Design a binder for these strands. Structure first.
Ligand code: MG
Ligand code: MG
Ligand code: MG
Ligand code: MG
Ligand code: MG
Ligand code: MG
Ligand code: MG
Ligand code: MG
Ligand code: MG
Ligand code: MG
Ligand code: MG
Ligand code: MG
Ligand code: MG
Ligand code: MG
Ligand code: MG
Ligand code: MG
Ligand code: MG
Ligand code: MG
Ligand code: MG
Ligand code: MG
Ligand code: MG
Ligand code: MG
Ligand code: MG
Ligand code: MG
Ligand code: MG
Ligand code: MG
Ligand code: MG
Ligand code: MG
Ligand code: MG
Ligand code: MG
Ligand code: MG
Ligand code: MG
Ligand code: MG
Ligand code: MG
Ligand code: MG
Ligand code: MG
Lengths: 167, 260, 155, 188, 131
RNA sequence: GCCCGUCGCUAGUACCGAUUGAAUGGCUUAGUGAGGCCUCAGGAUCUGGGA
RNA sequence: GGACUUUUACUUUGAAAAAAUUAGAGUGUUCAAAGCAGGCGUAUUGCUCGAAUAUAUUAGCAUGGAAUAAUAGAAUAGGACG
RNA sequence: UAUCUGGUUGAUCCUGCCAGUAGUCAUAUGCUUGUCUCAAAGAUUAAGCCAUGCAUGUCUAAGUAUAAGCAAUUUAUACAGUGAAACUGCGAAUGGCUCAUUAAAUCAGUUAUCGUUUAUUUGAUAGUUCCUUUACUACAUGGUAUAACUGUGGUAAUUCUAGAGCUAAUACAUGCUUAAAAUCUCGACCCUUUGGAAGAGAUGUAUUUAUUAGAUAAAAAAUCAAUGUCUUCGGACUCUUUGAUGAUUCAUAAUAACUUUUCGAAUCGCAUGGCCUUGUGCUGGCGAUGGUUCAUUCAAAUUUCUGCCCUAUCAACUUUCGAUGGUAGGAUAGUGGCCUACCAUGGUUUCAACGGGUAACGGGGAAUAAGGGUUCGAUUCCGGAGAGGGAGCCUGAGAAACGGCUACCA
């Protein structure tokens, strides 16, 4: 039951060091790596199973394959992904183009749609308004303290020059 | 050994807390914060071990998570948050205001203060530097940063601080004959004016202190906290005014007050 | 110790960031930086009059003096630009209620601003680690020689 | 890992010291960048506490500054011609601090003639002002002028390429320049 | 990892094991005060010994010395408190005197007998240990 | 009277000693050298010179 | 602030100073080993004393002393003050 | 709390040891054992070996919900309650245990960082992001590729996992923005002077380098090169600005540039209000999470002075293959023979080096009571070291980690 691994070549087994983000291994811990047996990516008669994917359809239909079609389970949830599964422009407004999956309670049939993200809404724009607001306000506010200290120091100088003229 | 320590064995705990020998094993490890470990009083110890308001520590979270208590004005909700010298604890319910200010033995005392004196604190500036873009800043013993302070303000000078806002509203220079609170050593919690300082270049200036009983004593400069003019403190001193009596003197005061 | 040549290494010996512009025709050839280590030690003129380069010199180089200030008597000057002093001291044994003579040898860097001979009492100032063993720097000669010229010939 | 502890290594007496503890990471060392010339290749290395160090290996350009001229230009790095620490660094053109290199000159030419109106070796209104303003100040220096002819200028790498991924220097001037020239030829 | 529960013993045993005289001496005391142990006598003479120690160590410090006055007074005021030390001899060269039966004469055991109420040092015991 | 040593019996301890005797532990020459790390390459694939 | 200063030992007071242990004050855990509590009233709406002190040496730091014991000084004057 | 007694002779006084005597937070063992309270306990020998279970996980109004989950009600046809799984984040570097190694090592008291790194907590801190700069760049907000899930499978076997089909973001990867001002270099034109100019660009922070400022030890002058401000056109310059330390090339700032360009909010929860030229315009409340640099706090790492048990049947030791120092570099968080080149010949020692031993972790301390001492500390607190032995390393702020991985040995 050892799995193959794209591009080992070899038609045998070996024991590779595997990492995050790689076939035939799921790290149990951050930066974990584990040595593991692997089957080559060259088909021998020692395989239990070939995994294959159809690329061209031959002259005849195959029963549980070409004949039957299984729906995709989930639909577009992020804003512009809906806008691209239907091709909409930033005009058409998603909210009514979201998918809608019916379901039944027994005598109460329901309706549940995603939760569109990266959707521009009043709430978001209010926070954008607030950010740019704070930056400037703080900037001006900060400039005033600058000048207020520049004064403390300017009329401290004319205190060492009315003291330097007193004597 | 491998990283930050996060526990505190009750016994290693600082003794001016007055924790008891048994009834556990650990003591609350003071959070990181504005005051150092060995000179702090963590909220848990104040709300419970002093004020007796809470019974458990578990109750202390319940009290705190109601934003009842607030240190120096901000709310604070850290069971172990390091509270310390000069700070202002306030129970919003019960109208109570406190200051953390040292005993004579050297411990923090339960010291009630007015609803108005509780709106400002004192801070010893620990350093003053030039910051980025030419802006000069002072830094106080409780880790406050205050941009643009008075040029006359230099290290060791104490400072009145708003609390409401951030700013400094006054300072006091370290001059001979200025009211001093002692924060450290065995003369911790005594109070007394300043005679003069011993220089010693390349380590540890001494400060010669005399109180209002013509008694003298010395501490390292770093242990000196300026707090006003002879007489005139800029904060209310606790009873006993940090004078320290002999064991004999103390015994008498305690056994002279006796006639029920 | 240094002496002669001054520009005698594979690398060009110079003081860091002490640029001298060749456009500007000057009468002293090399601009030279220095300081006083403080704590009261005069920065001897042979450091300012000097042309040596020693970056481990407390007056002309980038070392700071802080920590222990020690005196001890010089007993080895064979290491180029460093020496070994002996610091004696009695050590108290309780039970016998008497002391015994002890000593240690402290290795310390010595700038070509001083001219140290074996036998000289010297004061040194503590250092940042300067070599594998040296944690001190000769900061003042207390001695002289020990009346050597009063060991001359006959009448 | 390379360890930079002093716990190996005999004590000044010459004593052999028993091993106390295993190697700690915080006293670690790493291997040298041994950075060479040509076509940018830099590998960022993760150092203690966040913090990136940038390992240069192969570099062709670096920022080099004429000091008495007050400017800095970025040139090609021609090669390594003298190294006080080790000759294999010169022979194998390895870039490290203190290495003497040759650079390009034609950025330091393009600027000079455009700022002095003089040209080395061998008609605007305001420029004519400026050019005539300067001079009594254009007088360069013999052994730096003579280098532009060759097309190449001597300059000492003053940064640490194995650290910052920058290979930066200053054109060799006056005393220094004379020094290395004397070395260069009394070994040439 | 908990604080040590501290403890100490409260009695000490005769250097010589079989001194015929000290033995007679001891047995009598027991018989007089209704004791069951020779330990109960050991305990007291041990209390007495340390008291005498501190009394010695004090009386070598100067007259009117701080510690001597503080700790010395304290010592006496404790002794008078239980009625071992006489009001007259209230100055600790007679704490330095003192002796065992002065300590013995003050246990509940004895007082319950001394003023009537039991009419036997033993009945005295039996009564007390029976609530 | 005391008393010294060889010689003889029983038991016990340690010494010397063919076995170039044996065992454990710590360092270590020379030879061989896993593995991670750095580095010169590589390019199953997968996109915009990099992965 | 400038300009310079023969080195030491000893001793004094003092700073810096973990707790628990040790010595030890206060307090009747019913006594005690302990513990650091507890004590007062209006015991219906609180009053209040505590949680001391001492030892902590050898080294290092700081200060007073100038006996005892070392050291260096001016004789080919290459002396000292101006 | 300053005590001794029995034993050599016929008797004697000595010397001197053996025996007695007493305590032991000092272990065992034997006999005996009723009550309260207190409570040490697989250290010693084997840091020998380990069946089995357990000892590390974690969610707020507030990062991610189309569970084909539960609940239904109470307004919600994008979402909204609750919430498995999973993604993301943080933690797993604390704690607990043990005393194997370790003798100038650790450790202690005392120092140093002007020699560094630091998650976090706390306090401050960011108008600068684009471009040959009128026919413009998503900002009313840009990109996919993935778990869980669905379905098809493989092996005796594990916290094994493969091929196929989906789908999120505070994951991944991108990428706009904002006042005025001043200063700098360029400089189209005009005109001769003593000379001046429209307008063109550049200037956040970080990074790397070179250059400059960062005064002060009491006062004054002439001249060369450039070139500042005010004319009462020979001329003057008059007020003239300065932080800290015992000490710096310090803090901070200025110039020329450098960068596979660090950061400069494409984030989330509550409320929903002002305001007219009625655009769903422009505004706007409390606070979460974040974000750079600085500080602070929790730390860390090195580091000065002095102090260890027996040993000479250990006297010389150290540089093979760094031993002691200089120069340069490289490496590191950073000093440093830490490592490498070159060069030199040094460093330690009868005041005991070096070597050996330890049935050696170091301290706080424990036992013994005239005093002086003598013996002990594996073990409740602090420090250190380890995880069967060695080495190596991933992640990370922090490990040379072992209830993490890789390899060898057992
Ligand atoms: Mg969202
Ligand atoms: Mg805590
Ligand atoms: Mg200091
Ligand atoms: Mg030499
Ligand atoms: Mg054999
Ligand atoms: Mg390499
Ligand atoms: Mg003392
Ligand atoms: Mg006490
Ligand atoms: Mg006999
Ligand atoms: Mg006989
Ligand atoms: Mg006879
Ligand atoms: Mg005996
Ligand atoms: Mg064991
Ligand atoms: Mg044990
Ligand atoms: Mg739902
Ligand atoms: Mg631990
Ligand atoms: Mg992709
Ligand atoms: Mg991110
Ligand atoms: Mg000047
Ligand atoms: Mg200054
Ligand atoms: Mg700087
Ligand atoms: Mg509205
Ligand atoms: Mg032997
Ligand atoms: Mg070197
Ligand atoms: Mg040699
Ligand atoms: Mg000896
Ligand atoms: Mg051992
Ligand atoms: Mg121990
Ligand atoms: Mg021991
Ligand atoms: Mg052991
Ligand atoms: Mg470990
Ligand atoms: Mg084991
Ligand atoms: Mg080994
Ligand atoms: Mg390990
Ligand atoms: Mg385990
Ligand atoms: Mg562990």
């Amino acid at each position: 039951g050892f799995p193959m691994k794209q591009g080992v070549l070899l038609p045998t087994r070996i024991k590779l060091l595997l990492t995050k983000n790689v076939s035939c291994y799921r790290p149990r811990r951050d930066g974990e790596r584990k040595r593991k047996s692997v089957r080559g990516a060259i088909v021998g008669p020692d395989l239990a199973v070939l995994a294959l994917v159809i690329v061209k359809k031959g002259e005849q239909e195959l029963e549980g394959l070409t004949d039957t079609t299984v729906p995709k389970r989930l639909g577009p949830k992020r804003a512009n992904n809906i806008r691209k599964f239907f091709g909409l422009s930033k005009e058409d407004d998603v909210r009514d183009f979201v998918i809608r999956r019916e379901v039944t309670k027994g005598e109460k049939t329901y309706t549940k749609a995603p939760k569109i993200q990266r959707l521009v809404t009043p709430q978001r724009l209010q926070r954008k308004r607030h950010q740019r607001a704070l930056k400037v306000r703080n900037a001006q506010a900060q400039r005033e303290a600058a000048a207020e200290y520049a004064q403390l120091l300017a009329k401290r100088l004319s205190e060492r020059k009315a003291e330097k003229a007193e004597i | 050994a491998r990283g930050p320590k996060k526990h505190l064995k009750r016994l290693a705990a600082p003794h001016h807390w007055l924790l008891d020998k048994l009834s556990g094993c650990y003591a609350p490890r003071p959070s990181a914060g504005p005051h150092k470990l060995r000179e702090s009083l963590p909220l848990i110890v104040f709300l419970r071990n002093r004020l007796k308001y809470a019974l458990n520590g578990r109750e202390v979270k319940a009290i705190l998570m109601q934003r009842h208590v607030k240190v120096d004005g901000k709310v604070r909700t850290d069971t172990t948050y390091p509270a310390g010298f000069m700070d202002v604890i306030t129970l919003d319910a019960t109208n109570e205001n406190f200051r953390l200010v040292y005993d004579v033995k050297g411990r923090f005392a339960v010291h009630r203060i007015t609803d108005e004196e509780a709106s400002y604190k004192l801070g010893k500036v620990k350093k003053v530097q030039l910051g980025k873009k030419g802006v000069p800043y002072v830094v106080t013993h409780d880790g406050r940063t205050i941009r643009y302070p008075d040029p006359n303000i230099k290290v060791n000078d104490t400072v009145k601080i708003d609390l409401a806002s951030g700013k400094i509203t006054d300072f006091i220079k370290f001059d001979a004959g200025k009211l001093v609170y002692v924060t450290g050593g065995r003369n911790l919690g005594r109070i007394g004016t300043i005679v003069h300082k011993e220089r010693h270049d390349g380590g540890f200036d001494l400060v010669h202190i005399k109180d209002s009983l013509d008694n003298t004593f010395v501490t390292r400069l770093n242990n000196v906290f300026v707090i006003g003019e002879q007489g005139k403190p800029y904060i209310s001193l606790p009873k006993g005014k940090g004078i320290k009596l002999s064991i004999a003197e103390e015994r008498d005061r305690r056994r002279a007050q006796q006639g029920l | 110790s240094t002496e002669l040549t001054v520009q005698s290494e594979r690398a060009f010996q110079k003081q860091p960031h002490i640029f001298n512009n060749p456009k500007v025709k000057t009468s002293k050839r090399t601009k030279r930086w220095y300081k006083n280590a403080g704590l009261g030690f005069k920065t001897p003129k042979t450091a300012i009059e000097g042309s040596y380069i020693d970056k481990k010199c407390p007056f002309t180089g980038l070392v700071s003096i802080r920590g222990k200030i020690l005196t001890g008597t010089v007993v080895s000057t064979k290491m180029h630009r460093t020496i070994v002093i002996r610091r004696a001291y009695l050590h108290y044994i309780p039970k016998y209620n008497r002391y015994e003579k002890r000593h240690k040898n402290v290795p310390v860097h010595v700038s070509p601003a001083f001219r140290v001979q074996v036998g000289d009492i010297v004061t040194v100032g503590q250092c940042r680690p300067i070599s594998k063993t040296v944690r001190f720097n000769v900061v003042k000669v207390s001695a002289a020689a020990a009346k050597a010229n009063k060991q001359f010939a006959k009448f | 890992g390379i360890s930079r502890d002093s716990r190996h290594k005999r004590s000044a007496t010459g004593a052999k010291r028993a091993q106390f503890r295993k190697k700690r990471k915080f006293e670690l060392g790493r291997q040298p960048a041994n950075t060479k010339i040509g076509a940018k290749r830099i590998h960022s290395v993760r150092t203690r506490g966040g913090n990136k160090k940038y390992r240069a290996l192969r570099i062709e350009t670096g920022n080099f500054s004429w000091a008495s001229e007050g400017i800095s230009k970025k040139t090609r790095i021609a090669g390594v011609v003298y190294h006080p620490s080790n000759n294999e660094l010169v022979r194998t053109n390895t870039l490290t601090k203190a290495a003497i290199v040759q650079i390009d000159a034609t950025p330091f030419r393009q600027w000079f003639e455009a700022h002095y109106g003089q040209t080395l070796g061998k008609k605007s209104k305001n420029a004519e002002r400026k050019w005539a303003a300067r001079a009594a100040s254009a007088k360069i220096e013999s052994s730096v002028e003579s280098q532009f002819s060759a097309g190449r200028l001597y300059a000492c790498i003053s940064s640490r390429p194995g650290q910052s991924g920058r290979c930066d220097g200053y054109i060799l001037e006056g005393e220094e320049l004379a020094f290395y020239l004397r070395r260069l030829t009394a070994k040439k | 990892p908990r604080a040590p529960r501290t403890y100490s013993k409260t009695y000490s045993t005769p250097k010589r094991p079989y001194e015929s005289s000290r033995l007679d001496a001891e047995l009598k005391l027991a018989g007089e005060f209704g004791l069951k142990n020779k330990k109960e006598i050991y305990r007291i003479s041990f209390q007495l010994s340390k008291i005498r120690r501190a009394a010695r160590d004090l009386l070598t410090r100067d007259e009117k010395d701080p510690k001597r006055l503080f700790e010395g007074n304290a010592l006496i005021r404790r002794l008078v408190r239980v009625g071992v030390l006489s009001e007259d001899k209230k100055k600790l060269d007679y704490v330095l005197a003192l002796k065992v039966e002065d300590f013995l004469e003050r246990r509940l055991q004895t007082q319950v007998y001394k003023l009537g109420l039991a009419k036997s040092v033993h009945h005295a015991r039996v009564l007390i240990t029976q609530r």
